[PDB]
């Protein structure tokens, strides 16, 4: 079994709208395609003994073991590779269950689609499933060590990409509130929202956290100075640069009950909390002396409380207690630790509420000061601490005390955060009773921490959990404000670029910043950001991440959807212009019914409060109306369309072309926007396909809330001139003569141009070309189209690329054109440089020459040599 191709999808797609995270593997069954399990001895018992868990898979049978009801009756490795990749992810804790198998290409090549949680782990599991499955159809088993090492690699891949818990807390609430989010390419930042409404976070810091506040909070001497100048209670203490002055300092501080810290900040080490004697002060002095030259602070009694303030408002309070054991009967400390360290709520690292108690030389040092060691028996109800400070990660506890805090203490905490200029802050308070004023209990504020963690408030060991994230998202996205900008997505086989430029032009008349992407470039307010084919999800992301954009208009192509899914998840307006038989055979899509399923992806991602805009004159597009959860609007070139009539009779909205006007039907009322002949993109009303593109743009602007007068201004000033939209209806005026340069692909574009030509009430209709060598067997169809549209047909199909042989393409065109109307001077000249595209003097006054060049750049260069008007 060989893997030929792998795609990773990230967004709504062909296989599923909801299952955004999928891996599509193109698997070539060189073997096994002819051996449906019963032809592979031992491949039932081998598969189940290697992976005993593969009973939870259901398939066509809606049963536990439904997968295993088969396997022995094979599926030609469909299902088997698919279910193994899903199970290998489940075995390491990554849950995924969706999957599908479909045959493509030549017999034996399959598309295996499965769900992933982590992108690299997902691809890894796919490759591993193939190796496991291949060994078992060769031999009858799979070595245990070749399974254990793969599971270890999946566990590491799924760990390396994990978000920390403070980010997960904010992100989870953001999803509940429907706020879109993205990871950014630098410094572990996360973006929330689109365009002008975006915000950034990084763990517990945000776009609202100022630098002056954060730096002050990290300066202990600075913080203390600022707070005591505001009348806020802080510990009393001094500065001694390792001189033996401690015996005098206590006279200013308040006697011996003091705290001695290393003067600098280098972890919680070398700290004595309660000094009572001269020699103890010296032992603390000698340890303090290790760090650069917070000494002799008065010692205060009480518990360590953590107070969380988010926007100048109190959110949560927790009491923190260090790891300990108690005199739970006449047992020793080592016995007590083993007794309580078995508590089921104590689990490793960030895994369970509490963690394990670990003893080391530092725990012993703490125990010795209390008069105990590991073999000592504690008196009934005696409490012995194994740590000097409280921390959940070291085995301590956290108790929710949020509802027990006194109103005056609430007022003081909020004032502290405002004085030090921090939005999200942790405040460390020492007090014996949080329910009484700090001035009565003689409590103090010890520390102010910028960007505090949340584990103790969202997963306390006692009391109720608090939703800490909700107050954070409320300051970033205040009630009543948007987190998104409008998105207008345009798709269909033909007309996308033209429709996209017009719609962006109309929105722009409102004075807003409009960003858009097309196959030519990425633009913002007429400035070009990037050039080239900019369709697809990577370009959509440039506009959505841009801090200045208010409106996004995006043309959407099938290559983008099939290769990686949509970039935006949902939109306000989804426009489907047409479905036609182009690009068949590519991307595993062979039929028109399948092509319709790709285009329908846009209609199905429109938000229920938004609209889908459908073409009522197109049988595959109109039919999409029965899948759409959104409102539906229709457009047509014929008011007498039963769909339109049935729809407006139920008070729907439609856009039609009638009486020379482009108008909107809103229930019983008719709104005329303008006359087709006065809108410059349409050649005096002679280009029906340009009229249809204009109707779609007008209707999308209308249903999304723009006024009619704005729409009129937009259509009247819009241009598609040569050198703005080269190769797209460029009509050149050369005295009493015209030439048209265009660039059709699929047959619909040849018919659309042919109708323009039919309306040309001039003289001869000449055509100087046909298809290149990379088309399928549609050369005859082109010849049939030219035969009834032109009276001068000359063939040049011997281009420079010569994808296949020489002049055979021209020979097939000649066969086709002579099939329908063998009376149009059917010359074949083959050359198309300055030979046929220069021979314009063979056409009389007011005739029209239609050019279908391989290269537009040359066609519009040569036509200028004739000095056009």
């Amino acid at each position: 079994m060989k893997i030929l191709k792998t795609l990773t999808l990230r967004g709504p797609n062909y296989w599923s709208i909801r299952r955004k995270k999928l891996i599509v593997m193109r698997l070539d069954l060189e073997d096994l395609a002819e051996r449906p399990s019963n032809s592979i001895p031992g491949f039932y018992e081998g598969l189940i003994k290697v992976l005993p868990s593969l009973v939870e898979h259901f398939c066509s049978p809606g049963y536990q073991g439904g997968f295993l009801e088969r396997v022995k009756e094979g599926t030609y490795m469909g299902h088997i590779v698919e279910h193994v990749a899903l199970e290998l992810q489940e075995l390491v804790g990554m849950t995924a269950g969706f999957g599908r198998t479909r045959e493509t290409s030549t017999p034996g090549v399959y598309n295996v689609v499965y769900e992933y949680v982590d992108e690299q782990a997902g691809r890894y599991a796919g490759r591993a499933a193939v190796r496991l499955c291949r060994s078992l159809v060769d031999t009858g088993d799979y070595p245990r060590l070749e399974l254990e090492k793969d599971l270890e690699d999946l566990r590491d891949l799924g760990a390396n990409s994990a978000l920390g818990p403070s980010t997960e807390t904010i992100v989870t609430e953001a999803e509940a509130r429907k706020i879109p989010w993205m990871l950014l390419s630098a410094r572990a930042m996360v973006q929330l929202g689109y365009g002008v409404y975006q915000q950034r976070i990084q763990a517990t810091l945000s776009s609202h956290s100022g630098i002056l506040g954060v730096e002050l909070a990290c300066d202990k001497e600075g913080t203390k100075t600022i707070l005591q100048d505001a009348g806020i209670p802080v510990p009393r203490g001094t500065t001694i640069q390792y001189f033996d002055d401690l015996e005098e300092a206590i006279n200013d501080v308040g006697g011996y009950p003091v705290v001695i810290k290393p003067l600098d900040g280098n972890h919680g080490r070398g700290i004595t909390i309660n000094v009572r004697h001269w020699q103890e002060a010296i032992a603390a002095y000698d340890l303090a002396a290790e760090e650069s030259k917070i000494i002799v602070e008065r010692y205060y009694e009480g518990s360590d409380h953590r107070v969380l303030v988010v926007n100048g408002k109190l959110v949560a309070v927790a009491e923190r207690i260090p790891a300990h054991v108690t005199g739970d009967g006449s047992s020793t400390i080592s016995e007590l630790i083993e007794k309580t360290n078995q508590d089921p709520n104590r689990g490793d690292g960030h895994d369970n509420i509490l963690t394990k108690i670990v003893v080391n030389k530092t725990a012993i040092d703490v125990m010795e000061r209390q008069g105990y060691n590991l073999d000592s028996v504690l008196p009934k109800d005696e409490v012995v601490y194994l740590r000097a400070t409280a921390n959940l990660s070291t085995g301590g506890i956290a108790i929710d005390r949020t509802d027990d805090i006194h109103p005056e203490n609430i007022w003081l905490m909020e004032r502290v955060a405002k004085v030090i200029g921090l939005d999200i802050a942790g405040i460390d308070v020492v007090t014996s009773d949080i329910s009484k004023p700090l001035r009565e209990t003689n409590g103090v504020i010890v520390e102010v921490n910028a960007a505090p963690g949340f584990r103790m408030h969202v997963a306390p060991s006692q009391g109720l959990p608090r939703n800490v994230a909700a107050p954070v998202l409320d300051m970033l996205f205040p009630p009543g404000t948007p987190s998104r900008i409008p998105i207008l997505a345009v798709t269909g086989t033909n007309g996308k670029t033209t429709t996209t430029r017009l719609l962006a032009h109309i929105y722009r008349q409102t004075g807003k910043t409009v960003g858009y992407t097309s196959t030519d470039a990425i633009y913002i307010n007429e400035y070009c950001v990037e050039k080239g084919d900019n369709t697809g999800p990577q370009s959509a992301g440039v506009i959505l991440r841009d801090p200045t954009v208010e409106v996004a208009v995006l043309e959407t192509a099938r290559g983008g959807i099939l290769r990686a899914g949509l970039a935006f998840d949902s939109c306000d307006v989804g426009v489907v212009l047409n479905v036609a038989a182009d690009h068949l055979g590519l991307g595993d899509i062979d039929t028109i019914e399948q092509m319709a399923k790709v285009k329908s992806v846009i209609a199905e991602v429109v938000d229920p409060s938004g609209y889908a805009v459908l073409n009522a004159d197109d049988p595959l597009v109109a039919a999409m109306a029965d899948k759409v959860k959104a409102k539906v609007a229709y457009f047509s070139m014929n008011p007498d369309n039963p769909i339109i009539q049935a729809h407006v009779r139920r008070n729907g909205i439609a856009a039609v072309y009638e009486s020379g006007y482009l108008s909107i039907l809103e229930g019983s009322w008719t709104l005329r926007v303008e006359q087709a002949k006065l809108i410059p993109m349409t050649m005096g009303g002679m280009a029906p396909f340009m009229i249809a593109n204009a109707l779609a743009a007008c209707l999308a602007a209308f249903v999304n809330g723009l006024d009619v007068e704005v729409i009129r201004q937009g259509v009247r000033t819009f241009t598609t001139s040569a050198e703005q939209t080269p190769g797209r209806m460029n009509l050149f005026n050369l005295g009493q003569h015209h030439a048209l340069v265009d660039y059709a692909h699929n047959p619909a574009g040849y018919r659309a141009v042919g109708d323009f030509v039919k309306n040309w009430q001039g003289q001869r209709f000449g055509v100087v070309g046909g298809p290149g060598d990379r088309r399928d067997s549609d050369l005859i169809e082109l010849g049939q189209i030219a035969a009834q549209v032109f009276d001068r047909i000359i063939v040049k199909e011997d281009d420079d690329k010569r994808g296949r042989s020489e002049g055979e393409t021209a020979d097939l065109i000649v066969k086709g054109i002579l099939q329908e109307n063998p009376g149009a001077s059917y010359e074949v000249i083959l050359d198309e440089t300055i030979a046929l595209n220069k021979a314009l003097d063979q056409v009389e006054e007011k005739g029209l020459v239609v050019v279908f060049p391989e290269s537009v750049t040359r066609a519009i260069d040569l036509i200028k040599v004739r000095n056009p008007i």
Binding site: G164, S166, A203, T204, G426, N449, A451, P452, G453, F454
Partner: peptide, 4 residues
């Protein structure tokens, strides 16, 4: 430094 994070989670202070």
């Amino acid at each position: 430094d994070d989670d202070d």
